[PDB]
Amino acid sequence: KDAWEIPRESLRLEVKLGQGGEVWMGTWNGTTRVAIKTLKPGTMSPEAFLQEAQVMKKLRHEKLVQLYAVVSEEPIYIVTEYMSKGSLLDFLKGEMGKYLRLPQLVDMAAQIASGMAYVERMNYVHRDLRAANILVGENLVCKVADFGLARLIEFPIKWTAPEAALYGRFTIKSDVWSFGILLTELTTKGRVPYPGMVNREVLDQVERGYRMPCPPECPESLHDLMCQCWRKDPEERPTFEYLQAFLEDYFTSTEPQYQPGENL
Numbered sequence: 001k002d003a004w005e006i007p008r009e010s011l012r013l014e015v016k017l018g019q020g021g022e023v024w025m026g027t028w029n030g031t032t033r034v035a036i037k038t039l040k041p042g043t044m045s046p047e048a049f050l051q052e053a054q055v056m057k058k059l060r061h062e063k064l065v066q067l068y069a070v071v072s073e074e075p076i077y078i079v080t081e082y083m084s085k086g087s088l089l090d091f092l093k094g095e096m097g098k099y100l101r102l103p104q105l106v107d108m109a110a111q112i113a114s115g116m117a118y119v120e121r122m123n124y125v126h127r128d129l130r131a132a133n134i135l136v137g138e139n140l141v142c143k144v145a146d147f148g149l150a151r152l153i154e155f156p157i158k159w160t161a162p163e164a165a166l167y168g169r170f171t172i173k174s175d176v177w178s179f180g181i182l183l184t185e186l187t188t189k190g191r192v193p194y195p196g197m198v199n200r201e202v203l204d205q206v207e208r209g210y211r212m213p214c215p216p217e218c219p220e221s222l223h224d225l226m227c228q229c230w231r232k233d234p235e236e237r238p239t240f241e242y243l244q245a246f247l248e249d250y251f252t253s254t255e256p257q258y259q260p261g262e263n264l
């Protein structure tokens with residue numbers, strides 16, 4: 001057992017924030033607001049449930065959801081930090097959605113690209129990168145999460161690169177693709193990529209060279225970044241280090257003459 005092993009009674013689960021096990025907002029050692037991901041026995045394999053905690057032990061970054069502790073004895077628990085604003089998907093679709101603008105939305109994208117550039121230096125792949133897996137706290141802080149499929153190197157189709165959805169080639173540039181889809185989520189405020197298309201139709205058109213057009217009120221200089229994320233050859237895609245640098249200097253180097261619109 002590791003040093004992440006805490007007593008099974010040191011947690012006081014309270015409010016459930018969504019379930020599938022479930023997700024609870026509770027207490028740790030008396031005073032720590034935490035988020036407790038739990039394994040509700042569906043007789044699910046705990047080695048397949050602690051695999052999400054195995055990767056979360058080696059990844060520490062200010063833009064990643066910080067694991068707090070693990071309970072590896074049935075029933076299984078996973079304790080992480082509590083994000084006060086919930087998932088980014090619900091945030092873009094919630095009441096704050098209509099008020100978000102391009103300066104704030106690009107900032108959230110630079111935080112995601114910062115945390116996605118961290119694990120790019122650690123030689124890991126996330127494999128389920130999407131706004132439904134990004135979590136928001138106060139001050140518009142976005143930490144990527146849901147490492148239940150992340151693993152060290154050696155489907156939700158609409159977010160996956162073709163070579164990963166087709167040939168299982170989940171690499172550092174297969175998530176760069178999902179980042180470009182994440183940029184369409186942020187620019188449309190939570191809308192589903194490829195409107196009106198089913199998973200099979202997306203797989204057919206993406207393999208035929210089809211790419212999503214420019215979101216309304218989105219600058220072509222940002223949709224160009226999405227196309228670079230959606231390049232067929234995985235090595236043509238930009239690094240997350242370039243992605244984080246691009247989005248941090250966006251309104252000085254790329255769009256210095258940005259004027260706000262009704263939506264962006």
Ligand SMILES: CCN1Cc2c(ccc(F)c2C#N)O[C@@H](C)CNC(=O)c2c(N)nn3ccc1nc23
Nearest residue numbers: 017018023035037081082083086087133134145146
């Ligand atoms: C225990 C880990 N998870 C589960 C989780 C989600 C939603 C998206 C995610 F990428 C993750 C992850 N990884 O759970 C959703 C069902 C609901 N969870 C929350 O609204 C939440 C929150 N407000 N802070 N916070 C912190 C952690 C946390 N979930 C939350």
